[PDB]
Design a protein around this ligand. Structure first.
Ligand code: 5N9
Ligand code: 5N9
Lengths: 204, 204
């Protein structure tokens, strides 16, 4: 039968690399789908999408018709222009960053998870990290981005990090894997889980 | 828009690993499809399948509505049971292997490419390498298989190689990449080509 895997934008692509390497060996067709973390959960719930596996950071225990396991952790950072105001203060709190503009990830349904619910009251919603960064690089605000996006930008100084007194080394965020009940009865999935887990570990 | 990549069974899975790693970065949805090498070409020709990229070993310059490039080489071997008759003779020719039973890959359309057209006159068609090997291990005949299938079997002695005076180190077979004209105008594809090429090289 056909499979349809979903990976949110927070998960780096070299992960879907190793996901498809494994699943094809014991399948016919594997469809990889990318979505904003704000849209990931809402997508699988639609019975119309026939999503069989979802791999995202958003959290929910009330998801129905699916199950839930943990694959590992990804990494995120609070970034802002190097000359952005809050780099002068090595001691900026949540209530201090809530008074500036955040570049959040707006959802296509309007709902906002407790995960990606913006922190600031002055917010400017986007649908993807590429646009979140095009703004943050212009100094329009700050935002929380995956490590793989802000990796190059941080090394060459186009972009600085604000989240080091909060959590040194970046904000670790669980990657979860929702999966439809029927795949419980199958090896390859268990083989995929063990490989996906060892795959997210190697990214540290 | 949506993409649908096709990989034949002769190409190992860790290759579709690196194919999807690259394409997703600059796409929304990538669908990976596995097919017997005998069925690969016939599939893309069907305009009903909406195949956008095909990656197989079968050869044809008259393919219409597509283009054609070369990605690298895979490897194959002529294998047979270790106690199979033709291991006694270190000097078996094509006309000597044509008198025994071959386990070929039959096609769903009946047609047989000049590539996978069986060599022997006594042939037993299968649709996949797993069944080709279940027979060859039983000593029902010999067959031409990809390196990644007969890798473990050869190391632990469950299966021997007959194709070393023909071509030492295994029969190298070009992997090609057929691709629809519209993708000519795009970077990621050129980025995919250069990565897929360096990916098949690393498998040597
Ligand atoms: C420096 C300190 C004073 O400020 C902050 C520290 C931490 C947080 C913070 N909020 C939400 C979460 C939940 N997880 C994510 C939310 C959004 N996106 C992502 C990802 F980028 F991974 F996709 C992950 C994690 N951390 C917010 C602030 Cl403002
Ligand atoms: C030892 C010698 C005396 O015998 C032989 C030597 C070589 C050949 C031979 N024939 C066809 C081709 C074409 N390429 C493939 C055909 C089928 N399958 C595959 C793959 F496995 F890769 F998918 C590749 C290559 N080689 C046949 C014989 Cl009998």
């Amino acid at each position: 039968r056909n499979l349809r895997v979903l990976l949110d934008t927070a998960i780096p692509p070299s992960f879907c690399d190793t996901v498809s390497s494994v699943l094809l060996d014991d399948f016919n067709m594997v469809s990889l789908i990318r979505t904003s973390p704000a849209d990931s959960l809402a997508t699988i719930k639609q019975d119309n999408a026939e999503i069989d596996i979802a791999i995202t950071i958003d959290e929910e225990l009330k998801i129905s018709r699916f199950n839930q396991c943990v694959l590992g952790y990804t990494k995120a950072f609070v970034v802002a222009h190097p000359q952005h105001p809050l780099c002068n203060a090595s001691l900026h709190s949540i209530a201090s960053l809530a008074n500036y503009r955040q570049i959040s990830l707006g959802s296509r349904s309007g709902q906002h998870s407790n995960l990606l619910r913006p922190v600031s009251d002055k917010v400017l919603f986007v649908e993807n990290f590429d646009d979140m960064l095009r703004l943050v690089e212009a100094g329009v605000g700050w935002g929380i981005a995956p490590h793989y996006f802000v990796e190059e930008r941080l090394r060459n100084g186009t972009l600085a990090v604000l989240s080091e007194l909060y959590e040194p080394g970046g904000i670790d965020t669980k990657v979860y894997c929702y999966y439809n009940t029927a795949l419980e009865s199958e090896r390859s999935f268990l083989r995929f889980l063990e490989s996906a887990r060892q795959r997210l570990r190697e990214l540290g």
